[PDB]
């Protein structure tokens, strides 16, 4: 009888949000295959 | 074969007691992409 429902919650309210974030392991792999990838193909057989 | 202006690097290594142990000049081996763009670099290598 003290809390008015239109005033808003009086307890703890858990908000949320999606975030784009790559892990460290995923970034290390991306460096391996996209910037440190010096395989013979992708260099000489690219035509 | 070279017989004779600055594309070299001074390479330094130190040990734990702050002492330089290498202090040597060096030159970078060509990348395979550089060989692809200039095949005479493989001949020089």
């Amino acid at each position: 009888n003290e809390w008015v429902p239109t005033s808003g919650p009086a307890w703890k309210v858990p908000y949320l949000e999606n975030v784009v974030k790559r892990s460290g392991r995923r970034l290390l792999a991306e460096l391996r295959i996209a910037s440190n990838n010096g395989s013979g193909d992708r260099t000489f057989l690219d035509d | 074969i070279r017989v004779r202006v600055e594309g070299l690097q001074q390479i330094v290594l130190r040990n734990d007691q702050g002492s330089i142990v290498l202090d040597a000049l060096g030159t970078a081996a060509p990348s395979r992409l550089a060989v692809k763009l200039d095949w005479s670099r493989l001949s020089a290598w």
Partner: peptide, 28 residues
Amino acid sequence: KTLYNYYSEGPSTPIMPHLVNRLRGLDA
């Protein structure tokens, strides 16, 4: 072509089209 021609060419841009035109010429 002749053997004199091939000995003065050297590898070039894309090396797979090279080395196969050369091989066909050497076989010829």
